[PDB]
């Protein structure tokens, strides 16, 4: 237990380590996706259109 | 007899509620806060405990309490003792012992029961489980209370409190290095202890004991520290080195290590004044000017007034060396005003720089600034007069006359004019052209700024440094929102 807590815990160090570059990949990719869907819903808005009244 | 006899049991019954409510609030708040996971939640009571300490530094607590109010002294924590389970009858006892002193009276005294404060720390401080945090949370607040009024043979009582403090925790520790929130508390708590009886220390003794051990306790932390409390322990060492060390092969640049994350929102200011005070004896003109003025501008929280007269006074003391002495301009408080009330005639006597008059003026009403010790930077001032005055000559026109400006500098010879002007030339702080065509000495005296004079290279470094400061401030608005969204 006591001295096994060290090397047992090291695997939790590594498993929490692997989430770092993963959250880097998500944080770099999903904002690119955000400007993807942002520009794509922007280009839905086109200037030829009909005028109504509220 | 009716005047104080009728208003005697009235006034008192008022700090009792806020001190008992305070010790239950920060005691039960600290234990009840970090009890389950002390290691997860850290330093939440750091600002709480220090703000209670600075909240109780201005206590008008004991004025009349020597006469029959001393029941608060033998009473203490008494929380959940003698057995770690089955504390419900002790939850009854909490109301019981507080209610025993509230029936009629109590047999009370002041100076008798001091030495057996170790009765519970022998067996169980509070619970036998949270013994470190309850031991320091029990003992360490009440020791400045009874060891307040350091005078009148309480210095010996302070020595008893010393050996009790070391004897239970800080002889080594009970577990060497606790490695928790009360380890991180115990850094500045043990430091605060050593500052508190440092008055006892310098009162009769000097550097020769716990201060010499404090290097070993200073390095017993293992080095893996953030070194905040290690820096606070360094501050008592450097203040101990202020009055008399003068050797520079250890503390100066040697003590200078990694420069850890040493913040406290106070310790930048007072640490920086301490190293600026010791770096003020070699007459630092560039660095200690700006950063010691910065340390003046730090610590705004409690007072900007009562202490910053010292960094302010030392600051203007080294500012008038450079010829340009800014007075008290933008800060209005009548403490620095009375601080410079002797200094004003001489600091206005800097710029005109009249030798024979102002030499008499300094020592004339010189009482406290020349009783402040050893006349050092004023004795450098006494021949810095003509150098700052001739620096005003450098702020004036180029050619040096043999009658007008030589007589005006009270200095009437062809040799010493060009000679001491040449002593300003070997500085490099000026711009001058040594020319002899007929014997008259020229200077180009060009104070042209870099506006249309190599600007890219000039504020090149300003752009890089300034953007690094602004962009590390961008880091300082990135990471504390991480410290916001961490809990949720």
């Amino acid at each position: 237990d006591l001295y096994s807590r060290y090397k047992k815990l090291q695997q939790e160090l590594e498993f929490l380590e692997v989430q770092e570059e993963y959250i880097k990949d998500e944080q770099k990719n999903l904002k690119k996706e955000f400007l993807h869907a942002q520009e794509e819903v922007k280009r839905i808005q086109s200037i030829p259109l009909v005028i109504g009244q509220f | 007899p009716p005047g104080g006899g009728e208003q005697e049991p009235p006034p008192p019954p008022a700090p009792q509620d806020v001190e008992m409510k305070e010790e239950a609030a920060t005691g039960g708040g600290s234990t009840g806060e970090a009890d389950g996971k002390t290691a997860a939640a850290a330093a939440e009571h750091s600002q709480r405990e220090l703000d209670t300490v600075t909240l109780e530094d201005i206590k008008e607590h004991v004025k009349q309490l020597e006469k029959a109010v001393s029941g608060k002294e033998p009473r203490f924590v008494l929380r959940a003792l003698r057995m770690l389970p089955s504390t419900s009858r002790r939850l009854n006892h909490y109301v019981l012992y507080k209610a025993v002193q509230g029936f009629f009276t109590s047999n009370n005294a002041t100076r008798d029961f001091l030495l057996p404060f170790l009765e519970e720390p022998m067996d169980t401080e509070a619970d036998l489980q949270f013994r470190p945090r309850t031991g320091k949370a029990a003992s360490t607040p009440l020791l400045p209370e009874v060891e307040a009024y350091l005078q009148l043979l309480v210095v010996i009582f302070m020595m008893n409190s010393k050996r009790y403090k070391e004897a239970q925790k800080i002889s080594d520790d009970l577990m060497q290095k606790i490695s928790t929130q009360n380890r991180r508390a115990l850094d500045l708590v043990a430091a605060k202890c050593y500052y508190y009886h440092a008055r006892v220390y310098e009162f009769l003794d000097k550097l020769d004991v716990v201060r010499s051990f404090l290097h070993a306790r200073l390095r017993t932390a293992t080095l893996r520290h953030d070194a905040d409390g290690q820096a606070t322990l360094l501050n008592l060492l450097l203040r101990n080195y202020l009055h008399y060390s003068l050797y520079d092969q250890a503390e100066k640049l040697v003590s200078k290590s990694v420069f850890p994350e040493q913040a406290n929102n106070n310790e930048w200011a007072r640490y920086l004044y301490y190293t600026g005070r010791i770096k003020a004896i070699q007459l630092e003109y560039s660095e200690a000017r700006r950063t010691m003025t910065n340390a003046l501008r730090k610590a705004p929280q409690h007072t900007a007034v009562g202490f910053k007269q010292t960094v302010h006074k030392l600051l203007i003391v080294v500012e008038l060396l450079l010829g340009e002495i800014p007075d008290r301009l933008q800060f209005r408080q009548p403490s620095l005003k009375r601080s410079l009330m002797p200094y004003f005639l001489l600091t206005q006597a800097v710029r005109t720089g009249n030798l024979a008059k102002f030499n008499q003026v300094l020592d004339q009403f010189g009482e406290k600034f020349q009783a402040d010790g050893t006349y050092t930077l004023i004795i450098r001032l006494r021949h810095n007069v003509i150098k700052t005055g001739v620096r005003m000559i450098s702020l004036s026109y180029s050619r040096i006359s043999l009658a007008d400006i030589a007589q005006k500098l009270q200095l009437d010879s062809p040799e010493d004019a060009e000679f001491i002007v040449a002593k300003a030339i070997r500085d490099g702080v000026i711009e001058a052209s040594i020319n002899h065509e007929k014997g008259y000495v020229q200077s180009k005296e060009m104070i042209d700024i870099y506006s249309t004079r190599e600007p890219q290279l000039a504020f090149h470094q300003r752009i890089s440094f300034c953007l690094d400061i602004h962009n590390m401030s961008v880091k300082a608005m990135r990471f504390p929102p991480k410290s916001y969204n961490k809990d949720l």
């Binding site: 944080q27 | 190599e454 090149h460 752009i463 890089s464 953007l467 690094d468 962009n471 880091k475 990135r478």
Partner: protein
């Protein structure tokens, strides 16, 4: 005598001459443009690293 072998300067017609004084030609601005380009690289870094 000593300063003719210590300084090693020109000794003129009863005058003491001063050379190599503010003679320097200014920079090409190219190498500081390269280190400014490295500053721009580190601005893309420090502005956008964690992102």
């Amino acid at each position: 005598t000593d300063y003719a072998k210590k300084r090693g300067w020109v000794l003129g017609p009863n005058n003491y001459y001063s050379f190599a004084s503010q003679q320097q030609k200014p920079e090409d601005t190219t190498i500081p443009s390269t280190e400014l380009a490295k500053q721009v690289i580190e601005y893309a870094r420090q502005l956008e690293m964690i992102v």
